[PDB]
Design an enzyme around this catalytic site. Structure first.
Site, PDB file in Angstrom:
ATOM      1  N   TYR A  47      -8.095   6.217  17.331  1.00 57.87           N
ATOM      2  CA  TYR A  47      -7.362   6.486  16.094  1.00 57.87           C
ATOM      3  C   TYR A  47      -7.153   8.012  15.956  1.00 57.87           C
ATOM      4  CZ  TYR A  47      -6.193   7.341  11.298  1.00 57.87           C
ATOM      5  OH  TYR A  47      -5.629   7.806  10.137  1.00 57.87           O
ATOM      6  N   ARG A  71       0.861  -1.200   0.000  1.00 59.59           N
ATOM      7  CA  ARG A  71       0.000   0.000   0.000  1.00 59.59           C
ATOM      8  C   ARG A  71       0.891   1.242   0.000  1.00 59.59           C
ATOM      9  NH1 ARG A  71      -5.577  -0.527   1.120  1.00 59.59           N
ATOM     10  NH2 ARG A  71      -5.594   1.007   2.834  1.00 59.59           N
ATOM     11  N   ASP A 110      -3.274  12.711   8.860  1.00 51.46           N
ATOM     12  CA  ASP A 110      -4.563  12.385   8.318  1.00 51.46           C
ATOM     13  C   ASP A 110      -5.293  13.741   8.133  1.00 51.46           C
ATOM     14  OD1 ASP A 110      -7.409  11.725   8.042  1.00 51.46           O
ATOM     15  OD2 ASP A 110      -7.050   9.818   9.013  1.00 51.46           O
TER      16      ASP A 110
END
Ligand SMILES: NC(=O)c1ccc[n+]([C@@H]2O[C@H](COP(=O)([O-])OP(=O)(O)OC[C@H]3O[C@@H](n4cnc5c(N)ncnc54)[C@H](OP(=O)(O)O)[C@@H]3O)[C@@H](O)[C@H]2O)c1
Ligand SMILES: NC(=O)c1ccc[n+]([C@@H]2O[C@H](COP(=O)([O-])OP(=O)(O)OC[C@H]3O[C@@H](n4cnc5c(N)ncnc54)[C@H](OP(=O)(O)O)[C@@H]3O)[C@@H](O)[C@H]2O)c1
Ligand SMILES: NC(=O)c1ccc[n+]([C@@H]2O[C@H](COP(=O)([O-])OP(=O)(O)OC[C@H]3O[C@@H](n4cnc5c(N)ncnc54)[C@H](OP(=O)(O)O)[C@@H]3O)[C@@H](O)[C@H]2O)c1
Ligand SMILES: NC(=O)c1ccc[n+]([C@@H]2O[C@H](COP(=O)([O-])OP(=O)(O)OC[C@H]3O[C@@H](n4cnc5c(N)ncnc54)[C@H](OP(=O)(O)O)[C@@H]3O)[C@@H](O)[C@H]2O)c1
Ligand SMILES: Nc1nc2ccc(SC(F)(F)F)cc2s1
Ligand SMILES: Nc1nc2ccc(SC(F)(F)F)cc2s1
Ligand SMILES: Nc1nc2ccc(SC(F)(F)F)cc2s1
Ligand SMILES: Nc1nc2ccc(SC(F)(F)F)cc2s1
Lengths: 251, 252, 253, 250
Positions: free
Chosen positions: A157, A13, A144
């Site tokens: 998370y 990935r 993120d």
């Protein structure tokens, strides 16, 4: 002599695409992995066929525990053992799964995985990377872009990725005197989770203003390549969103 | 059983004490959580119970990250329900604060358990317990830090923990909104300086603050907490109010 | 006509000049917009055209806010299509920067027109004109922002208002132009080339605050981030602002 | 003895709720309006019936122009003429409508209206407030959604981002004079009159806390906090009052 980089979670990935691209740019690479041993050795074999002695693997579980600091020391040590130097650290490995607040693993396993992999291992890797210094040294943290508009029921998370923003800033500040830059790359939606059905993948795709599709792994890797490059030599403490506009879209 | 009830962590001294006092003054029954400060906790409960009988209890727990932290956080929330039959407000105030240099006698894993455990994981577990156990006005207030983006040199783990607490504030606001539980933060700049800090270094900080060249009192921090738990904040969730006298606007 | 073309505002000197040079090095034809610096603008165009003929033109315009600013901005974009038959990149670089104290020879309405016109309104009007012209390609806009807008210099309210408005434009235009394939990003320097006024000792106060090397960014280091954002390596990046500030904005008072 | 406040665009909706709650708190109020003359005089009548000589109206257009500075000076002067002091300025008036980048007002008029009302007028009102100078403060009505803006609202969004910039810059600069400067940022509160009921419900359904818009009074509550003695160490802060709307991904 060619520089050397460590990429965590590099067997598949996004971390694979980052290690391939650093390798294409002239780096020698440590392919860190946890469970994906076949995929890791295979990638290293591919890179070594392209240029001999330029890739090694290194196994480590980056869950938080009293031995995480030694495992992080060893990852960095493996780069110096193989290559004699360690110029770049990419903190890519990450756990990602829901942890609902109102009601599988115990909660302290969830904390060790989601905070350990996403935040504490990057911190200890950063300590080890910095302490082993005797050139364009930098660290890139995979952040993120959606941490202020989080997915429902992903509090641990989210907490880990906010902590990684804090490490990015605090380590940039502290390591600037040693010439080590510390920056981040913040994907929106990139390679969707394998467990996700196409229908759910498409729901996410349709939200992205720029092309209604997820980032390719290569597109994420391009921003990492920029930040390690001599074209980013005054950049430290920056987080580059790579999200096709997703974070600008209201509910 | 008509008075609402609040839990305040690290409530024996300084900012948590001021918060507990002001909630009590507003009509709350209060749980005064302490770790090492037993005598001070009990002295405060005595003071509040003299004002209004049986309206303040103490609860001891260590909020370091461990295999037992979940049980300790459950017991803090349980103690409010036992004493008072309800738990309307959780104030996550307890915090460890000290430097953790990246280039180098607590082990690093102990520093983690305190700076990440006490400032982020305990609030997360207390939030889960508070939510699980639920004209109500339920809310959580997290004590954040207005200088999280311009942090003190060599404070990486502390900074990480306070950023994690912003993440908890937002994620819990989203997820608990359906239950009518608001989740907000108060971010001081310099308020009561660490007791260990030298006088010259305290004054160096006070001189930086645009609004009056002084630190916030604990009561000024408490005032923002009181606003956020009040009926005047019933549409506010996911908000962090800076209470810093403008310090975070000042460039280097 | 295979070579793409770029408009750079305020391109005669300093950061805009470095951006126009690097874009040209990358294979762009360039419109060098200027206001007062005609000699420097022409000198850069002549240098660039010596390197490759017919690859650089100048365009003069005042970007102060007024009744005629929309027509001026339309004319700057039109100049790129007349010179080169296309306009692939717009870099909003031109900027006025001076203090505007709240408490007490330009009038305040002139201060508003200059500080909000150059930093925010002209970028918006140029963005409208650029998009209206677009109905293998890699179209993008890069806005020169400021990494210190949340820790602003004392008495620079109108300047800081203009640069916050430019963040808002960057985000709003990214969202609205993404369907046309136009990406919109920013580069936020902290301290780069210090204003010509400042003496070595005052420049040195600012340099000493920068964690990464205790020096200001070169104009070329700022240009490098612009080059990345307009490149094929940034084709999924829109609505993003890249700080290029050596860690300055991380440093507490 | 009673402090005095100026509220811009105070005839209707959120500014009206702010004027009412300041008045209920003890303030004398200048009710600024542009077009809503009947509603402004009507509110002033209601407040003066409650306490005589405690409300005046002041008419002004807050579009940007070479006379905007004089209009803003006049609004602050009206407070001093009526009440002899001006303790609080609330920058609430605002134009809000789309300005698409790709294609009956000229673009120069849309810039003057959206950047003048949302940003320039607040700056000039701030200048006049400061110059003419207890618990002095300014509250700017900002917008919680400016990093996740509505499609085609670039000029409105630019103005509201500029207002954040003003909040920070003026908080820094006016702190030595004891003037605090803060903001309140609604998500969806009272929806635009022109918006159809079906679209109103689409917005209401997005709000995590209650699936409803904020009342005008809930917005005013946050303004009352920031001007109060309970906010005396708060400056340069913007309080979101948005029921979690800005937390919700696409
Ligand atoms: N994919 C997206 O859409 C997206 C969006 C936002 C942010 N990101 C961020 O971008 C980065 C790359 O994303 P991705 O999708 O490539 O990540 P991913 O596939 O979810 O995880 C990458 C690798 O992390 C390693 N990992 C997981 N748990 C671990 C543990 N306890 N110890 C050591 N390694 C562990 C795994 O290695 P093994 O397979 O060897 O066990 C895994 O292959 C991540 O940090 C992610 O949070 C991604
Ligand atoms: N003071 C400031 O200027 C300032 C600035 C920014 C943010 N803050 C935030 O405001 C909040 C209150 O600040 P403060 O100065 O009042 O904090 P503080 O005095 O440093 O700590 C508050 C209490 O936290 C408890 N605590 C520490 N470690 C613990 C552990 N392992 N387990 C259980 N409790 C523990 C201690 O209680 P016992 O005494 O009972 O052991 C301590 O008295 C904190 O969250 C802080 O980060 C304060
Ligand atoms: N330099 C830094 O440290 C720094 C720091 C933060 C952000 N930035 C931003 O980066 C960009 C470049 O900085 P810089 O130092 O190179 O800029 P600068 O030298 O201050 O200004 C660039 C050019 O702007 C043009 N300009 C000024 N007022 C104008 C008007 N009314 N109409 C048209 N053009 C006008 C001028 O062109 P003429 O000379 O042709 O009249 C000037 O040469 C700016 O947006 C600045 O805000 C720079
Ligand atoms: N309503 C919401 O959901 C919401 C959401 C986010 C932010 N906000 C912010 O909160 C504040 C109040 O919201 P609202 O819905 O009450 O505002 P609004 O009803 O849209 O506008 C308030 C008043 O502004 C005045 N105004 C408009 N153009 C003007 C001009 N050229 N000159 C002078 N005044 C002018 C008008 O006064 P006249 O009627 O007297 O002409 C109008 O009644 C605004 O700043 C808004 O941006 C509101
Ligand atoms: N370790 C990992 N983190 C993330 C974050 C978001 C995403 S994209 C999604 F799932 F739509 F939120 C995938 C991954 S895999
Ligand atoms: N738990 C605690 N956190 C902090 C954060 C800042 C401060 S003010 C200081 F130390 F100047 F940064 C004191 C404390 S005590
Ligand atoms: N047009 C311009 N904007 C700026 C912003 C900062 C700076 S660096 C300084 F002056 F130290 F703040 C120079 C300029 S020139
Ligand atoms: N002047 C005004 N500004 C706004 C901003 C948002 C809103 S809510 C909406 F329209 F859903 F975006 C109403 C108004 S009225």
């Amino acid at each position: 002599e060619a520089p050397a980089a460590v990429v965590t979670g590099a067997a598949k990935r996004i971390g694979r695409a980052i290690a391939v691209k650093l390798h294409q740019t002239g780096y020698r690479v440590v392919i860190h992995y946890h469970n994906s041993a076949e995929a890791a050795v295979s990638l290293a074999d591919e890179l070594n066929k392209e240029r001999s002695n330029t890739a090694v693997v290194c196994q480590a579980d980056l869950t938080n525990s009293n031995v995480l600091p030694a495992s992080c020391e060893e990852i960095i040590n493996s780069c110096f053992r193989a290559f004699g130097r360690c110029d770049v650290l990419v903190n890519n490995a990450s756990a990602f799964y829901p942890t609902p607040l109102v009601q599988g693993k115990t909660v302290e396993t969830q904390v060790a995985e989601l905070i350990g992999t996403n935040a504490i291992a990057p911190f200890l890797l950063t300590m080890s990377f910095a302490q082993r210094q005797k050139s364009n040294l930098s660290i890139v943290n995979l952040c993120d872009a959606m941490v202020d508009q989080p997915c429902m029921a992903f509090s641990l998370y989210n907490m880990g990725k906010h902590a990684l923003v804090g490490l990015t800033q605090s380590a940039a500040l502290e390591l600037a005197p040693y010439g080590i830059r510390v920056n981040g790359v913040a994907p929106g939606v990139s390679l969707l989770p394998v467990a996700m059905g196409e229908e759910e993948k498409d729901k996410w795709r349709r939200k992205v203003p720029l092309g209604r599709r997820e980032a390719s792994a290569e597109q994420i890797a391009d921003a990492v390549i920029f930040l390690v490059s001599g074209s980013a030599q005054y950049i430290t403490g920056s987080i580059i969103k790579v999200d096709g506009g997703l974070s600008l879209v209201h509910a």
